[PDB]
Design a protein around this ligand. Structure first.
Ligand code: AZR
Length: 243
């Protein structure tokens, strides 16, 4: 890689242009944030976290003894938006499937009051979870910079939760293994006032133990497959030589 920064920026901008979306992908190396993509001003704008919030819901539920990691959440038998959710599952399984009913149940066990306190204590986003404990991941919003930093915190065990709570949640987030590098992350897709947001927020753990946090953020459009979030992310990390 004698590749110019101009060429990196152009290549990653083109992965967003080809998907016909507007988005950004923030990469963090040590303390330095780099911003890539075809809509850089997204970096400090606020969007609903949607399902990226499952990472924090899990940390809170575990820290506070609302569940354990091997506990099986039974499917209640009612029809689900997706068949894959019609099954009994652990928090970790529900993370990978982004299964809402499980994370909703966990949120209800935690309850609105404790969820409020705990979201303030962690200072996640704008920190407002409103009056509904299972529908809030509006008015809670967060920026892509704030997401990559949250990812940075979790990857290095700096959030204010016990170490073992943080390691337990990190084990849930492994979504890919590419050439001795592991990718931990959580996806999101939220409907906002007039637009949809897509997220993929996590970190690359390299063979040598180095951790590189990232947050992809983009506009989802009718018709898009969700796996475009992953594909843009993996191409970008690869172009940068990070995986
Ligand atoms: C998690 O992000 C989850 N997203 C949602 O359930 C929300 N969805 O809105 C969609 C896009 C499905 C819709 O058209 O209604 C949501 C939660 S809070 C908010 N403002 N919107 C998805 C399905 N899981 S994921 O892994 O695909 O991201």
């Amino acid at each position: 890689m004698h590749i110019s920064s101009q060429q990196h920026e152009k290549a990653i901008k083109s992965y967003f242009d080809e998907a016909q979306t507007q988005g950004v992908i923030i990469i963090k190396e040590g303390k330095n944030l780099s911003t890539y993509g075809n809509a850089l001003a997204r970096a400090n704008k606020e969007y609903v976290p949607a399902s990226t919030f499952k990472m924090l819901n899990a940390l809170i539920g575990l820290e506070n003894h609302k569940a354990t990691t091997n506990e099986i959440f039974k499917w209640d038998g009612k029809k689900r938006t997706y068949p894959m959710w019609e099954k009994d599952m652990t928090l970790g399984e529900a993370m990978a499937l982004s299964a809402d009913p499980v994370y909703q149940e966990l949120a209800r066990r935690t309850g609105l009051e404790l969820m409020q306190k705990e979201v303030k204590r962690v200072n996640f986003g704008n920190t407002n979870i409103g009056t509904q404990v299972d529908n809030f991941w509006g008015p809670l919003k967060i920026t892509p910079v704030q997401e990559v930093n949250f990812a940075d915190d979790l990857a290095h065990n700096r959030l204010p939760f016990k170490l073992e709570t943080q390691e337990e949640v990190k084990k849930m987030l492994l979504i890919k293994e590419v050439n001795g590098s592991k990718i931990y992350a959580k996806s999101g897709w939220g409907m906002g006032v007039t637009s949809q947001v897509g997220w993929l927020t996590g970190w690359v753990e390299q063979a040598n133990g180095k951790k590189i946090p990232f947050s992809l953020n983009l506009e989802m459009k009718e018709g898009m497959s969700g796996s475009i979030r992953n594909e843009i992310t993996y191409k970008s990390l690869e172009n940068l030589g990070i995986i």
